[PDB]
Amino acid sequence: PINVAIFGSTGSIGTNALNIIRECNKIENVFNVKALYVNKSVNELYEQAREFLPEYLCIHDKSVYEELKELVKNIKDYKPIILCGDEGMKEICSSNSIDKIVIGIDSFQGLYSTMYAIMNNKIVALANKESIVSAGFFLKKLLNIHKNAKIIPVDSEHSAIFQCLDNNKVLKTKCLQDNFSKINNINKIFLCSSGGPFQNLTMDELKNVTSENALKHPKWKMGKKITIDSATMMNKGLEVIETHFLFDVDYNDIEVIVHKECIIHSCVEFIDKSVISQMYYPDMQIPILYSLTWPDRIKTNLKPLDLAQVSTLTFHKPSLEHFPCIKLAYQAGIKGNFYPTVLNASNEIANNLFLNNKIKYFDISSIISQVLESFNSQKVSENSEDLMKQILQIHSWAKDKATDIYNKHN
Amino acid sequence: PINVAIFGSTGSIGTNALNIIRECNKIENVFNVKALYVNKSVNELYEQAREFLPEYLCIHDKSVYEELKELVKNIKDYKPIILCGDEGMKEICSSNSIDKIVIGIDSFQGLYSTMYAIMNNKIVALANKESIVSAGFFLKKLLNIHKNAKIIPVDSEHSAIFQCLDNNKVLKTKCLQDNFSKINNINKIFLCSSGGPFQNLTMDELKNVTSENALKHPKWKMGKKITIDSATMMNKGLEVIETHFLFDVDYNDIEVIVHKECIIHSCVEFIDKSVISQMYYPDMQIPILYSLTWPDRIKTNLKPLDLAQVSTLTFHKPSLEHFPCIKLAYQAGIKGNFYPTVLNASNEIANNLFLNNKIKYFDISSIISQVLESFNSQKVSENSEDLMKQILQIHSWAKDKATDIYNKHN
Numbered sequence A, B: 001p002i003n004v005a006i007f008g009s010t011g012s013i014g015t016n017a018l019n020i021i022r023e024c025n026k027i028e029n030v031f032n033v034k035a036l037y038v039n040k041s042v043n044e045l046y047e048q049a050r051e052f053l054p055e056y057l058c059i060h061d062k063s064v065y066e067e068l069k070e071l072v073k074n075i076k077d078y079k080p081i082i083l084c085g086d087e088g089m090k091e092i093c094s095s096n097s098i099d100k101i102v103i104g105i106d107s108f109q110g111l112y113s114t115m116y117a118i119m120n121n122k123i124v125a126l127a128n129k130e131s132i133v134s135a136g137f138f139l140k141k142l143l144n145i146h147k148n149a150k151i152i153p154v155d156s157e158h159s160a161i162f163q164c165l166d167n168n169k170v171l172k173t174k175c176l177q178d179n180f181s182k183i184n185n186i187n188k189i190f191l192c193s194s195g196g197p198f199q200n201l202t203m204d205e206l207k208n209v210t211s212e213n214a215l216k217h218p219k220w221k222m223g224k225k226i227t228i229d230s231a232t233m234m235n236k237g238l239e240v241i242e243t244h245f246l247f248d249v250d251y252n253d254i255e256v257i258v259h260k261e262c263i264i265h266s267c268v269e270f271i272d273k274s275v276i277s278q279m280y281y282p283d284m285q286i287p288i289l290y291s292l293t294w295p296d297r298i299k300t301n302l303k304p305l306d307l308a309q310v311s312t313l314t315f316h317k318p319s320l321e322h323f324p325c326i327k328l329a330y331q332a333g334i335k336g337n338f339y340p341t342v343l344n345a346s347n348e349i350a351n352n353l354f355l356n357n358k359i360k361y362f363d364i365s366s367i368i369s370q371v372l373e374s375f376n377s378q379k380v381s382e383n384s385e386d387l388m389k390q391i392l393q394i395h396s397w398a399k400d401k402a403t404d405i406y407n408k409h410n
């Protein structure tokens, strides 16, 4: 039995996790959902509790906690431990009946839970890549202290890369640890991208694309923020840095490749030059599922890949002139220090402005470029708590700087 | 330092093995070529001996044995053990100073060295699919007895499949052992094929193809016999049965896919429906190398795959009407018993007839089909040597039968 907690259980990743768990458990009873944690959606948590009957329930919003207790009374033969706020989150993390925790919470709250999962030596199925991009240093330090803690990637390209590895080697190291590449004989990564909706556009057409254009025909079902990032290819830029940190691959050895059919999810080139790749329909259930079964696999009733029907797969290089966010990402990542934090934070702002029709496509990369240019390297704290504060402070500064640039721009 | 013997060193597999060995050794000293064995090409063996200076030399044909000595006399500072025939082959296989044996003698003669390599508990890097097809059950029996022997596949599609597997699972089983696919969580195999030169021919055009046509512009550089089998897709038919025996995959779960770019070498679908595939340019050096380094990989300086340049990859189902040898292979595999032995033997004859312009394209399948039709199942001998004799008997019968059908037809 695999004992799993889901943090952010009503979000996109959390609901998809519960769905694949539900379907796999119908084939063979494999998963015990031990804990559910949601922010404010008390009715939804009740509905999930009702079905999965976890040992622990936690609602963050303290205002709705009594309500939740009332609701859950109505579930027969069920007496969970019902908690609330950060304190309930920490109690769940410390439970020895939980082996794996899905982090389906974004933003800072997600980093805080991640930290507690790591501090409790858990397997952390991490779907918030922004924490890896912005706080990579902090997570690396934390994983060095907590030896048995492991981050398993859920972002599809990174899951794919992870799935292309030999677990006989993987088990001698772990993600976000120096030497992961050496131990796994990794030479190079092909990081695949859908390319978004603008691949064939000229620079003059790109100048006038709108967020309505950007949210059209996404190849995956996803939130607005990531969909804008897909259109600018900043999503892939961020994913380049995620790759560097998870797998200890040099920036030079990470190649972004536009694969519009979204069947090959990424590929790993090993030192002999043999390449291995992972393929499936664009469906988040596979990467989520693997993060819960690794190092095993279990039976599903997902539709099998029909290669003959797919028929054709295509690959081309992205143009850095048309997708300058990609260049900025490499530049920030290579510079290192806290430039990735700055890149991520300034993009948060620039992305939202474009989403809301306040700036134009090349304004996004312009703003980000300017914030990056304004930032001066800071000495990296050795102290873990000081380091975390540095990251938050720089993140906050970068958001304000991005906003100030927008505000001062006519 | 890996100690290697090459059986059939002057064939396409052998020369490719020496080349990748030579190149890897220029990076770092990794392989010792301990032994070279050829059927009768003295001048070529002598050139190989001059460069690699192996401890052992073996020429099967004794009529050219003294000639070999006379040639090797010339090489200075070099006093190798110069053996001949089956006896020298046996002496090489049982030497302690040999860890891995590359079998690149495809002729059913290669069965013998395969056997002796297994009997001496070696790692057998096997590129003689005919022995697996004809004697699979026998080899399985032998591997059950010799617990430390391992067959590592060299045939490119089977190396690909093997490379897509998690060695943390592989090491709990071995090729040609019951339950290999269960232990490795294998649901299905996409067995890729170049398709040969005749994929786009109509039925009428196919009726007329000659061996000249078939040997034209092939996607891989190999011997005539396999190049003809590639044209008829009987090579893929044999490889279906090879897949069944190596990995214990049901015939129902093996799908042949025509992939004309020859970049994806085959794919594995796991029980969760995730697919993993192995890719490289069409170059036998990678699968050979992996068989010699498994469970590890080592650095090469081979050209890195450039996916963007390759640009497009395509997949389609083969037409069984155009390629009836595929259907015959499945039918023989599904029936089991000694039908694969008969399939392989009859094809040896039919292939050579076509190669030599004695029969037509559809005469190949017709002959094979008729020989299969004329065979009745036999009691499988439980004694291992009785079983070998049975296999040689039936193989020899099937060749005679196929020759008779040809001789009697106008």
Ligand SMILES: CN(O)C(=O)C[C@@H](CP(=O)(O)O)c1ccccc1
Pocket (backbone or CB within 6 Å): A155, A156, A157, A192, A193, A194, A195, A196, A218, A219, A220, A221, A222, A226, A227, A228, A229, A230, A231, A235, A236
């Ligand atoms: C699934 N996954 O891991 C993603 O990163 C989804 C991205 C893919 P990309 O950045 O366009 O390559 C995406 C595509 C389309 C719309 C929104 C996001």
Ligand SMILES: CN(O)C(=O)C[C@@H](CP(=O)(O)O)c1ccccc1
Pocket (backbone or CB within 6 Å): B155, B156, B157, B192, B193, B194, B195, B196, B218, B219, B220, B221, B222, B226, B227, B229, B230, B231, B235, B236, B284
């Ligand atoms: C490399 N390898 O493992 C082979 O089986 C070579 C075959 C490939 P196929 O049977 O055409 O798919 C082949 C293709 C073209 C010419 C000769 C052989």
Ligand SMILES: [Cl-]
Pocket (backbone or CB within 6 Å): A012, A222, A223, A226
């Ligand atoms: Cl999302």
Ligand SMILES: [Mn+2]
Pocket (backbone or CB within 6 Å): A155, A156, A157, A239
């Ligand atoms: Mn992604």
Ligand SMILES: [Mn+2]
Pocket (backbone or CB within 6 Å): B155, B156, B157, B239
């Ligand atoms: Mn092959």
